[PDB]
């Protein structure tokens, strides 16, 4: 049963990360990204007001808002920190979408994010050491 397999894998990964170990390189990247997001959001709220509700998201304007914010973010450059900002932005978009009962946007926001990573961030990422470098730099924080 894949369901059970995925469960065992998720659980074991969580337990390994709690000790500074990792189930796989993908797992360590995930754990690093989650932690960097928490830290980034913490440092964001202590300086500003929630990145979540500010923009008025609607199914019809969501994409455009995502694109405007995201293009200005990497207009003059890409770096790990901005990527974390990006991930955290997408995350707040989804949280806001669910709060406002536009649950269907979450899978779209998800797609728009992977697409933007695959197309516009991957090049820089490969060129700068891949995600393993990201893990060295933001791992276990």
């Amino acid at each position: 049963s894949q369901s059970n397999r995925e469960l065992v894998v998720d659980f074991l990964s969580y337990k390994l990360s709690q000790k500074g170990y990792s189930w796989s390189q993908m797992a360590a990247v995930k754990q690093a990204l989650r932690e960097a997001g928490d830290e980034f959001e913490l440092r964001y709220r202590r300086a500003f007001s929630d990145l979540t509700s500010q923009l008025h998201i609607t199914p019809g304007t969501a994409y455009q808002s995502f694109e405007q914010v995201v293009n200005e973010l990497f207009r003059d450059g890409v770096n790990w920190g901005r990527i974390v900002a990006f991930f955290s932005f997408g995350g707040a978009l989804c949280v806001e979408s669910v709060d406002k009962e536009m649950q269907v946007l979450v899978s779209r926001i998800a797609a728009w994010m992977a697409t933007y990573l695959n197309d516009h961030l991957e090049p820089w990422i490969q060129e700068n050491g891949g995600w393993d470098t990201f893990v060295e730099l933001y791992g276990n924080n």
Partner: peptide, 24 residues
């Protein structure tokens, strides 16, 4: 409005940038 976006991008860029610099 739309001015909210410029402002959000800016706050995200500085926050990230500071975050990047503090890991070097």
């Amino acid at each position: 409005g739309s001015g909210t976006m410029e402002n959000l991008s800016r706050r995200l860029k500085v926050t990230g940038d500071l975050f990047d610099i503090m890991s070097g």
